[PDB]
PDB file of N, CA and C in Angstrom:
ATOM      1  N   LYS N   1     -16.109  20.720 -21.843  1.00 42.04           N
ATOM      2  CA  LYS N   1     -15.043  20.120 -21.000  1.00 42.04           C
ATOM      3  C   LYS N   1     -14.413  18.909 -21.676  1.00 42.04           C
ATOM      4  N   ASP N   2     -13.095  18.944 -21.839  1.00 43.62           N
ATOM      5  CA  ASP N   2     -12.378  17.839 -22.465  1.00 43.62           C
ATOM      6  C   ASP N   2     -12.043  16.755 -21.441  1.00 43.62           C
ATOM      7  N   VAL N   3     -12.679  16.832 -20.277  1.00 45.14           N
ATOM      8  CA  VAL N   3     -12.456  15.868 -19.207  1.00 45.14           C
ATOM      9  C   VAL N   3     -13.001  14.488 -19.566  1.00 45.14           C
ATOM     10  N   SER N   4     -14.157  14.465 -20.223  1.00 43.83           N
ATOM     11  CA  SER N   4     -14.792  13.209 -20.610  1.00 43.83           C
ATOM     12  C   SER N   4     -14.230  12.669 -21.921  1.00 43.83           C
ATOM     13  N   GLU N   5     -13.299  13.399 -22.524  1.00 43.70           N
ATOM     14  CA  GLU N   5     -12.698  12.963 -23.779  1.00 43.70           C
ATOM     15  C   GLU N   5     -11.936  11.658 -23.588  1.00 43.70           C
ATOM     16  N   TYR N   6     -11.344  11.490 -22.411  1.00 44.99           N
ATOM     17  CA  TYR N   6     -10.595  10.278 -22.103  1.00 44.99           C
ATOM     18  C   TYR N   6     -11.325   9.454 -21.046  1.00 44.99           C
ATOM     19  N   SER N   7     -11.165   9.863 -19.793  1.00 44.13           N
ATOM     20  CA  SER N   7     -11.795   9.194 -18.663  1.00 44.13           C
ATOM     21  C   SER N   7     -12.137  10.209 -17.582  1.00 44.13           C
ATOM     22  N   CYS N   8     -12.335   9.725 -16.363  1.00 46.25           N
ATOM     23  CA  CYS N   8     -12.659  10.594 -15.240  1.00 46.25           C
ATOM     24  C   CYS N   8     -13.663  11.669 -15.641  1.00 46.25           C
ATOM     25  N   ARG N   9     -14.754  11.249 -16.273  1.00 47.28           N
ATOM     26  CA  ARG N   9     -15.793  12.178 -16.701  1.00 47.28           C
ATOM     27  C   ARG N   9     -16.292  13.003 -15.521  1.00 47.28           C
ATOM     28  N   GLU N  10     -17.400  13.708 -15.720  1.00 43.55           N
ATOM     29  CA  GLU N  10     -17.983  14.518 -14.659  1.00 43.55           C
ATOM     30  C   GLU N  10     -18.505  13.610 -13.554  1.00 43.55           C
ATOM     31  N   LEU N  11     -17.578  13.005 -12.823  1.00 42.40           N
ATOM     32  CA  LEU N  11     -17.920  12.087 -11.747  1.00 42.40           C
ATOM     33  C   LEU N  11     -17.922  12.783 -10.392  1.00 42.40           C
ATOM     34  N   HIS N  12     -18.873  12.393  -9.549  1.00 43.55           N
ATOM     35  CA  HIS N  12     -19.013  12.973  -8.215  1.00 43.55           C
ATOM     36  C   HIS N  12     -18.934  11.911  -7.123  1.00 43.55           C
ATOM     37  N   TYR N  13     -18.255  12.247  -6.027  1.00 42.47           N
ATOM     38  CA  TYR N  13     -18.101  11.331  -4.898  1.00 42.47           C
ATOM     39  C   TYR N  13     -18.558  11.982  -3.593  1.00 42.47           C
ATOM     40  N   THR N  14     -18.731  11.164  -2.553  1.00 40.41           N
ATOM     41  CA  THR N  14     -19.171  11.660  -1.254  1.00 40.41           C
ATOM     42  C   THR N  14     -18.160  11.345  -0.159  1.00 40.41           C
ATOM     43  N   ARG N  15     -17.109  12.150  -0.095  1.00 37.55           N
ATOM     44  CA  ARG N  15     -16.089  12.003   0.931  1.00 37.55           C
ATOM     45  C   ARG N  15     -15.954  13.329   1.657  1.00 37.55           C
ATOM     46  N   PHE N  16     -16.112  13.309   2.972  1.00 37.97           N
ATOM     47  CA  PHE N  16     -16.057  14.542   3.741  1.00 37.97           C
ATOM     48  C   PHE N  16     -14.805  14.650   4.604  1.00 37.97           C
ATOM     49  N   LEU N  17     -14.794  13.974   5.750  1.00 38.31           N
ATOM     50  CA  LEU N  17     -13.647  14.063   6.644  1.00 38.31           C
ATOM     51  C   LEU N  17     -13.718  13.052   7.785  1.00 38.31           C
ATOM     52  N   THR N  18     -12.587  12.415   8.072  1.00 40.72           N
ATOM     53  CA  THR N  18     -12.506  11.448   9.162  1.00 40.72           C
ATOM     54  C   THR N  18     -11.268  11.715  10.015  1.00 40.72           C
ATOM     55  N   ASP N  19     -11.451  11.745  11.332  1.00 42.87           N
ATOM     56  CA  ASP N  19     -10.344  11.993  12.255  1.00 42.87           C
ATOM     57  C   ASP N  19     -10.475  11.097  13.481  1.00 42.87           C
ATOM     58  N   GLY N  20      -9.749  11.424  14.565  1.00 42.51           N
ATOM     59  CA  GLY N  20      -9.822  10.622  15.781  1.00 42.51           C
ATOM     60  C   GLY N  20     -11.182   9.984  15.915  1.00 42.51           C
ATOM     61  N   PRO N  21     -11.267   8.766  16.481  1.00 43.79           N
ATOM     62  CA  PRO N  21     -12.495   8.006  16.659  1.00 43.79           C
ATOM     63  C   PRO N  21     -13.789   8.808  16.488  1.00 43.79           C
ATOM     64  N   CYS N  22     -13.917   9.441  15.319  1.00 43.95           N
ATOM     65  CA  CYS N  22     -15.085  10.235  14.945  1.00 43.95           C
ATOM     66  C   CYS N  22     -15.057  10.455  13.431  1.00 43.95           C
ATOM     67  N   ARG N  23     -16.180  10.859  12.851  1.00 42.78           N
ATOM     68  CA  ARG N  23     -16.234  11.089  11.415  1.00 42.78           C
ATOM     69  C   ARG N  23     -17.322  12.088  11.042  1.00 42.78           C
ATOM     70  N   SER N  24     -17.050  12.877  10.009  1.00 43.30           N
ATOM     71  CA  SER N  24     -18.003  13.866   9.526  1.00 43.30           C
ATOM     72  C   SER N  24     -18.914  13.257   8.480  1.00 43.30           C
ATOM     73  N   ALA N  25     -20.051  13.891   8.248  1.00 41.45           N
ATOM     74  CA  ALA N  25     -20.986  13.375   7.262  1.00 41.45           C
ATOM     75  C   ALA N  25     -21.772  14.470   6.547  1.00 41.45           C
ATOM     76  N   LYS N  26     -21.188  15.655   6.429  1.00 38.40           N
ATOM     77  CA  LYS N  26     -21.858  16.756   5.747  1.00 38.40           C
ATOM     78  C   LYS N  26     -21.732  16.588   4.235  1.00 38.40           C
ATOM     79  N   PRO N  27     -22.784  16.951   3.487  1.00 38.36           N
ATOM     80  CA  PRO N  27     -22.802  16.821   2.026  1.00 38.36           C
ATOM     81  C   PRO N  27     -21.582  17.445   1.357  1.00 38.36           C
ATOM     82  N   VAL N  28     -20.854  16.627   0.603  1.00 39.89           N
ATOM     83  CA  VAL N  28     -19.665  17.085  -0.106  1.00 39.89           C
ATOM     84  C   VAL N  28     -19.627  16.528  -1.523  1.00 39.89           C
ATOM     85  N   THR N  29     -19.105  17.317  -2.454  1.00 40.20           N
ATOM     86  CA  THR N  29     -18.988  16.871  -3.834  1.00 40.20           C
ATOM     87  C   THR N  29     -17.528  16.859  -4.263  1.00 40.20           C
ATOM     88  N   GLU N  30     -17.095  15.733  -4.807  1.00 38.98           N
ATOM     89  CA  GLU N  30     -15.723  15.582  -5.265  1.00 38.98           C
ATOM     90  C   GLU N  30     -15.680  14.742  -6.530  1.00 38.98           C
ATOM     91  N   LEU N  31     -14.693  14.999  -7.375  1.00 39.29           N
ATOM     92  CA  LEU N  31     -14.556  14.250  -8.609  1.00 39.29           C
ATOM     93  C   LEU N  31     -13.493  13.188  -8.484  1.00 39.29           C
ATOM     94  N   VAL N  32     -13.768  12.042  -9.071  1.00 40.42           N
ATOM     95  CA  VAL N  32     -12.838  10.942  -9.032  1.00 40.42           C
ATOM     96  C   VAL N  32     -12.027  10.905 -10.320  1.00 40.42           C
ATOM     97  N   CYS N  33     -10.938  11.666 -10.337  1.00 42.63           N
ATOM     98  CA  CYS N  33     -10.085  11.735 -11.513  1.00 42.63           C
ATOM     99  C   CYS N  33      -9.134  10.546 -11.563  1.00 42.63           C
ATOM    100  N   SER N  34      -9.583   9.478 -12.214  1.00 40.81           N
ATOM    101  CA  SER N  34      -8.783   8.270 -12.359  1.00 40.81           C
ATOM    102  C   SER N  34      -9.141   7.548 -13.652  1.00 40.81           C
ATOM    103  N   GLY N  35      -8.187   7.481 -14.570  1.00 37.91           N
ATOM    104  CA  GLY N  35      -8.421   6.823 -15.842  1.00 37.91           C
ATOM    105  C   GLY N  35      -7.128   6.482 -16.553  1.00 37.91           C
ATOM    106  N   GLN N  36      -7.132   6.618 -17.875  1.00 37.49           N
ATOM    107  CA  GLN N  36      -5.947   6.340 -18.678  1.00 37.49           C
ATOM    108  C   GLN N  36      -5.741   7.442 -19.712  1.00 37.49           C
ATOM    109  N   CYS N  37      -4.492   7.853 -19.902  1.00 40.17           N
ATOM    110  CA  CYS N  37      -4.173   8.903 -20.863  1.00 40.17           C
ATOM    111  C   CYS N  37      -2.694   8.868 -21.237  1.00 40.17           C
ATOM    112  N   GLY N  38      -2.077   7.702 -21.082  1.00 43.13           N
ATOM    113  CA  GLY N  38      -0.669   7.562 -21.408  1.00 43.13           C
ATOM    114  C   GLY N  38      -0.398   6.382 -22.321  1.00 43.13           C
ATOM    115  N   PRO N  39       0.772   6.362 -22.976  1.00 42.64           N
ATOM    116  CA  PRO N  39       1.159   5.279 -23.887  1.00 42.64           C
ATOM    117  C   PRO N  39       1.208   3.921 -23.195  1.00 42.64           C
ATOM    118  N   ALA N  40       0.862   2.875 -23.936  1.00 42.46           N
ATOM    119  CA  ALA N  40       0.875   1.517 -23.402  1.00 42.46           C
ATOM    120  C   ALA N  40       2.211   0.843 -23.680  1.00 42.46           C
ATOM    121  N   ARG N  41       3.237   1.656 -23.887  1.00 42.25           N
ATOM    122  CA  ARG N  41       4.570   1.149 -24.179  1.00 42.25           C
ATOM    123  C   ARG N  41       5.194   0.472 -22.964  1.00 42.25           C
ATOM    124  N   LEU N  42       5.710  -0.734 -23.176  1.00 41.48           N
ATOM    125  CA  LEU N  42       6.356  -1.489 -22.108  1.00 41.48           C
ATOM    126  C   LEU N  42       7.868  -1.297 -22.180  1.00 41.48           C
ATOM    127  N   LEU N  43       8.490  -1.045 -21.036  1.00 39.94           N
ATOM    128  CA  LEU N  43       9.934  -0.834 -20.987  1.00 39.94           C
ATOM    129  C   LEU N  43      10.644  -2.003 -20.312  1.00 39.94           C
ATOM    130  N   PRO N  44      11.195  -2.929 -21.113  1.00 37.72           N
ATOM    131  CA  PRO N  44      11.915  -4.096 -20.593  1.00 37.72           C
ATOM    132  C   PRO N  44      13.257  -3.711 -19.977  1.00 37.72           C
ATOM    133  N   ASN N  45      13.385  -3.922 -18.671  1.00 37.00           N
ATOM    134  CA  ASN N  45      14.615  -3.599 -17.957  1.00 37.00           C
ATOM    135  C   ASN N  45      14.954  -4.671 -16.930  1.00 37.00           C
ATOM    136  N   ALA N  46      14.580  -5.912 -17.228  1.00 37.78           N
ATOM    137  CA  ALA N  46      14.840  -7.038 -16.335  1.00 37.78           C
ATOM    138  C   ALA N  46      16.333  -7.319 -16.175  1.00 37.78           C
ATOM    139  N   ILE N  47      17.169  -6.556 -16.875  1.00 37.06           N
ATOM    140  CA  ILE N  47      18.614  -6.727 -16.793  1.00 37.06           C
ATOM    141  C   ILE N  47      18.990  -8.186 -16.591  1.00 37.06           C
ATOM    142  N   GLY N  48      18.179  -9.062 -17.160  1.00 39.20           N
ATOM    143  CA  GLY N  48      18.421 -10.490 -17.056  1.00 39.20           C
ATOM    144  C   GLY N  48      17.428 -11.194 -16.151  1.00 39.20           C
ATOM    145  N   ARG N  49      17.116 -10.584 -15.011  1.00 39.87           N
ATOM    146  CA  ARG N  49      16.172 -11.175 -14.069  1.00 39.87           C
ATOM    147  C   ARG N  49      15.000 -10.233 -13.807  1.00 39.87           C
ATOM    148  N   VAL N  50      13.785 -10.771 -13.881  1.00 42.18           N
ATOM    149  CA  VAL N  50      12.583  -9.984 -13.659  1.00 42.18           C
ATOM    150  C   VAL N  50      11.827 -10.481 -12.435  1.00 42.18           C
ATOM    151  N   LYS N  51      11.793  -9.644 -11.416  1.00 40.53           N
ATOM    152  CA  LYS N  51      11.120  -9.962 -10.159  1.00 40.53           C
ATOM    153  C   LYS N  51      10.546  -8.698  -9.532  1.00 40.53           C
ATOM    154  N   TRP N  52      11.375  -7.670  -9.525  1.00 40.49           N
ATOM    155  CA  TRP N  52      11.034  -6.366  -8.975  1.00 40.49           C
ATOM    156  C   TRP N  52       9.812  -5.806  -9.696  1.00 40.49           C
ATOM    157  N   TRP N  53      10.043  -5.166 -10.833  1.00 38.36           N
ATOM    158  CA  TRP N  53       8.961  -4.628 -11.643  1.00 38.36           C
ATOM    159  C   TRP N  53       8.629  -5.641 -12.735  1.00 38.36           C
ATOM    160  N   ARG N  54       7.706  -5.288 -13.623  1.00 40.17           N
ATOM    161  CA  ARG N  54       7.329  -6.169 -14.723  1.00 40.17           C
ATOM    162  C   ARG N  54       6.518  -5.410 -15.768  1.00 40.17           C
ATOM    163  N   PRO N  55       6.762  -5.698 -17.057  1.00 37.98           N
ATOM    164  CA  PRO N  55       6.070  -5.043 -18.185  1.00 37.98           C
ATOM    165  C   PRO N  55       4.549  -5.225 -18.173  1.00 37.98           C
ATOM    166  N   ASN N  56       3.914  -4.999 -17.025  1.00 40.06           N
ATOM    167  CA  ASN N  56       2.468  -5.137 -16.919  1.00 40.06           C
ATOM    168  C   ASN N  56       1.773  -3.871 -17.420  1.00 40.06           C
ATOM    169  N   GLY N  57       2.568  -2.919 -17.903  1.00 45.55           N
ATOM    170  CA  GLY N  57       2.026  -1.672 -18.411  1.00 45.55           C
ATOM    171  C   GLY N  57       2.308  -0.497 -17.496  1.00 45.55           C
ATOM    172  N   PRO N  58       2.540   0.698 -18.066  1.00 43.16           N
ATOM    173  CA  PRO N  58       2.825   1.909 -17.291  1.00 43.16           C
ATOM    174  C   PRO N  58       1.605   2.407 -16.525  1.00 43.16           C
ATOM    175  N   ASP N  59       1.840   2.993 -15.356  1.00 45.23           N
ATOM    176  CA  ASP N  59       0.756   3.519 -14.537  1.00 45.23           C
ATOM    177  C   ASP N  59       0.398   4.944 -14.956  1.00 45.23           C
ATOM    178  N   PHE N  60      -0.697   5.082 -15.698  1.00 44.57           N
ATOM    179  CA  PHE N  60      -1.153   6.394 -16.153  1.00 44.57           C
ATOM    180  C   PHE N  60      -2.606   6.630 -15.756  1.00 44.57           C
ATOM    181  N   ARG N  61      -2.959   7.891 -15.527  1.00 40.72           N
ATOM    182  CA  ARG N  61      -4.320   8.240 -15.138  1.00 40.72           C
ATOM    183  C   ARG N  61      -4.529   9.748 -15.158  1.00 40.72           C
ATOM    184  N   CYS N  62      -5.744  10.174 -14.823  1.00 39.68           N
ATOM    185  CA  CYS N  62      -6.066  11.592 -14.793  1.00 39.68           C
ATOM    186  C   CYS N  62      -5.337  12.258 -13.633  1.00 39.68           C
ATOM    187  N   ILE N  63      -4.939  13.509 -13.818  1.00 36.15           N
ATOM    188  CA  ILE N  63      -4.222  14.231 -12.773  1.00 36.15           C
ATOM    189  C   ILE N  63      -5.036  15.399 -12.227  1.00 36.15           C
ATOM    190  N   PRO N  64      -5.304  15.395 -10.911  1.00 36.10           N
ATOM    191  CA  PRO N  64      -6.062  16.467 -10.257  1.00 36.10           C
ATOM    192  C   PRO N  64      -5.310  17.793 -10.312  1.00 36.10           C
ATOM    193  N   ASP N  65      -6.016  18.869 -10.650  1.00 36.05           N
ATOM    194  CA  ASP N  65      -5.387  20.183 -10.746  1.00 36.05           C
ATOM    195  C   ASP N  65      -5.796  21.099  -9.596  1.00 36.05           C
ATOM    196  N   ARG N  66      -7.069  21.474  -9.567  1.00 33.23           N
ATOM    197  CA  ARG N  66      -7.578  22.357  -8.526  1.00 33.23           C
ATOM    198  C   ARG N  66      -8.708  21.688  -7.753  1.00 33.23           C
ATOM    199  N   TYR N  67      -8.814  22.013  -6.470  1.00 32.69           N
ATOM    200  CA  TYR N  67      -9.842  21.427  -5.618  1.00 32.69           C
ATOM    201  C   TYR N  67     -10.766  22.495  -5.045  1.00 32.69           C
ATOM    202  N   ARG N  68     -11.936  22.058  -4.599  1.00 35.50           N
ATOM    203  CA  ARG N  68     -12.912  22.946  -3.996  1.00 35.50           C
ATOM    204  C   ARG N  68     -12.773  22.876  -2.485  1.00 35.50           C
ATOM    205  N   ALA N  69     -13.030  23.984  -1.818  1.00 37.59           N
ATOM    206  CA  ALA N  69     -12.898  24.027  -0.368  1.00 37.59           C
ATOM    207  C   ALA N  69     -14.138  23.485   0.333  1.00 37.59           C
ATOM    208  N   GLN N  70     -13.907  22.639   1.332  1.00 35.84           N
ATOM    209  CA  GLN N  70     -14.988  22.048   2.106  1.00 35.84           C
ATOM    210  C   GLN N  70     -14.672  22.134   3.596  1.00 35.84           C
ATOM    211  N   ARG N  71     -15.535  22.804   4.350  1.00 40.10           N
ATOM    212  CA  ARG N  71     -15.337  22.943   5.785  1.00 40.10           C
ATOM    213  C   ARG N  71     -16.479  22.295   6.550  1.00 40.10           C
ATOM    214  N   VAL N  72     -16.247  21.076   7.013  1.00 41.99           N
ATOM    215  CA  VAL N  72     -17.256  20.339   7.760  1.00 41.99           C
ATOM    216  C   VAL N  72     -16.681  19.759   9.040  1.00 41.99           C
ATOM    217  N   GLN N  73     -17.491  19.717  10.088  1.00 40.51           N
ATOM    218  CA  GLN N  73     -17.042  19.175  11.358  1.00 40.51           C
ATOM    219  C   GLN N  73     -17.357  17.685  11.444  1.00 40.51           C
ATOM    220  N   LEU N  74     -16.433  16.921  12.017  1.00 39.83           N
ATOM    221  CA  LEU N  74     -16.618  15.480  12.155  1.00 39.83           C
ATOM    222  C   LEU N  74     -17.525  15.162  13.329  1.00 39.83           C
ATOM    223  N   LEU N  75     -18.526  14.339  13.069  1.00 36.72           N
ATOM    224  CA  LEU N  75     -19.488  13.959  14.082  1.00 36.72           C
ATOM    225  C   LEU N  75     -19.109  12.644  14.745  1.00 36.72           C
ATOM    226  N   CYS N  76     -19.276  12.600  16.056  1.00 36.59           N
ATOM    227  CA  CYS N  76     -18.971  11.412  16.835  1.00 36.59           C
ATOM    228  C   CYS N  76     -20.249  10.857  17.455  1.00 36.59           C
ATOM    229  N   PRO N  77     -20.273   9.560  17.792  1.00 37.49           N
ATOM    230  CA  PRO N  77     -21.456   8.935  18.384  1.00 37.49           C
ATOM    231  C   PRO N  77     -21.988   9.734  19.567  1.00 37.49           C
ATOM    232  N   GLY N  78     -23.171  10.309  19.392  1.00 35.23           N
ATOM    233  CA  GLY N  78     -23.779  11.099  20.444  1.00 35.23           C
ATOM    234  C   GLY N  78     -23.557  12.589  20.253  1.00 35.23           C
ATOM    235  N   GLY N  79     -22.703  12.943  19.297  1.00 30.97           N
ATOM    236  CA  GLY N  79     -22.426  14.343  19.030  1.00 30.97           C
ATOM    237  C   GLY N  79     -21.930  15.082  20.259  1.00 30.97           C
ATOM    238  N   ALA N  80     -20.814  14.625  20.818  1.00 28.77           N
ATOM    239  CA  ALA N  80     -20.255  15.250  22.011  1.00 28.77           C
ATOM    240  C   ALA N  80     -18.857  15.817  21.767  1.00 28.77           C
ATOM    241  N   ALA N  81     -18.095  15.183  20.880  1.00 27.83           N
ATOM    242  CA  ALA N  81     -16.738  15.640  20.594  1.00 27.83           C
ATOM    243  C   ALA N  81     -16.532  15.944  19.113  1.00 27.83           C
ATOM    244  N   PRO N  82     -17.362  16.830  18.543  1.00 27.80           N
ATOM    245  CA  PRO N  82     -17.256  17.220  17.134  1.00 27.80           C
ATOM    246  C   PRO N  82     -16.022  18.077  16.867  1.00 27.80           C
ATOM    247  N   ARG N  83     -15.411  17.885  15.703  1.00 26.39           N
ATOM    248  CA  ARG N  83     -14.225  18.650  15.326  1.00 26.39           C
ATOM    249  C   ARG N  83     -14.367  19.198  13.913  1.00 26.39           C
ATOM    250  N   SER N  84     -13.687  20.306  13.633  1.00 27.87           N
ATOM    251  CA  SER N  84     -13.750  20.926  12.314  1.00 27.87           C
ATOM    252  C   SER N  84     -12.542  20.539  11.467  1.00 27.87           C
ATOM    253  N   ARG N  85     -12.797  20.162  10.216  1.00 25.40           N
ATOM    254  CA  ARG N  85     -11.724  19.769   9.311  1.00 25.40           C
ATOM    255  C   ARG N  85     -11.943  20.318   7.901  1.00 25.40           C
ATOM    256  N   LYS N  86     -10.841  20.705   7.260  1.00 28.37           N
ATOM    257  CA  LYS N  86     -10.879  21.234   5.902  1.00 28.37           C
ATOM    258  C   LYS N  86     -10.581  20.127   4.895  1.00 28.37           C
ATOM    259  N   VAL N  87     -11.207  20.193   3.723  1.00 29.05           N
ATOM    260  CA  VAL N  87     -11.000  19.181   2.703  1.00 29.05           C
ATOM    261  C   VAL N  87     -11.045  19.773   1.302  1.00 29.05           C
ATOM    262  N   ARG N  88      -9.956  19.593   0.576  1.00 32.29           N
ATOM    263  CA  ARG N  88      -9.849  20.073  -0.797  1.00 32.29           C
ATOM    264  C   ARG N  88     -10.285  18.982  -1.770  1.00 32.29           C
ATOM    265  N   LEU N  89     -11.333  19.253  -2.542  1.00 28.49           N
ATOM    266  CA  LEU N  89     -11.844  18.270  -3.498  1.00 28.49           C
ATOM    267  C   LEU N  89     -11.670  18.729  -4.942  1.00 28.49           C
ATOM    268  N   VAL N  90     -10.932  17.951  -5.721  1.00 27.33           N
ATOM    269  CA  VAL N  90     -10.697  18.282  -7.121  1.00 27.33           C
ATOM    270  C   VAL N  90     -12.002  18.573  -7.853  1.00 27.33           C
ATOM    271  N   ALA N  91     -12.474  19.812  -7.756  1.00 23.58           N
ATOM    272  CA  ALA N  91     -13.704  20.201  -8.432  1.00 23.58           C
ATOM    273  C   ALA N  91     -13.451  20.376  -9.926  1.00 23.58           C
ATOM    274  N   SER N  92     -12.179  20.283 -10.314  1.00 24.23           N
ATOM    275  CA  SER N  92     -11.787  20.412 -11.712  1.00 24.23           C
ATOM    276  C   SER N  92     -10.391  19.828 -11.932  1.00 24.23           C
ATOM    277  N   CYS N  93     -10.295  18.835 -12.812  1.00 25.81           N
ATOM    278  CA  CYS N  93      -9.014  18.196 -13.107  1.00 25.81           C
ATOM    279  C   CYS N  93      -8.894  17.880 -14.595  1.00 25.81           C
ATOM    280  N   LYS N  94      -7.695  17.489 -15.026  1.00 26.69           N
ATOM    281  CA  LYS N  94      -7.465  17.155 -16.424  1.00 26.69           C
ATOM    282  C   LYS N  94      -6.796  15.794 -16.541  1.00 26.69           C
ATOM    283  N   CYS N  95      -7.086  15.079 -17.622  1.00 27.04           N
ATOM    284  CA  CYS N  95      -6.493  13.768 -17.836  1.00 27.04           C
ATOM    285  C   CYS N  95      -5.119  13.913 -18.472  1.00 27.04           C
ATOM    286  N   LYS N  96      -4.086  13.830 -17.645  1.00 27.83           N
ATOM    287  CA  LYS N  96      -2.721  13.965 -18.118  1.00 27.83           C
ATOM    288  C   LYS N  96      -1.842  12.827 -17.611  1.00 27.83           C
ATOM    289  N   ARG N  97      -0.888  12.418 -18.446  1.00 30.51           N
ATOM    290  CA  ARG N  97       0.034  11.339 -18.107  1.00 30.51           C
ATOM    291  C   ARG N  97      -0.624  10.320 -17.183  1.00 30.51           C
TER     292      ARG N  97
END
């Protein structure tokens, strides 16, 4: 896997699903595709005045491609109003732009 070649290596996270005053907590695996893979070239366009944007560097990172399907119900205090929610987790992504 050329995923670890740059950033966002084989990383795993635990995010399931949250909705109306309730939340799910079923085991879920997701990758955190966030890193750097773009030029550090700064583009000066202050057209005289710089306030809006600033040459602090371009925003580049890994880009999620495909996600894994996760079907878990959100649990509420006391388990009385549980709900089902779908969640797509980038089980595979590439570091682009």
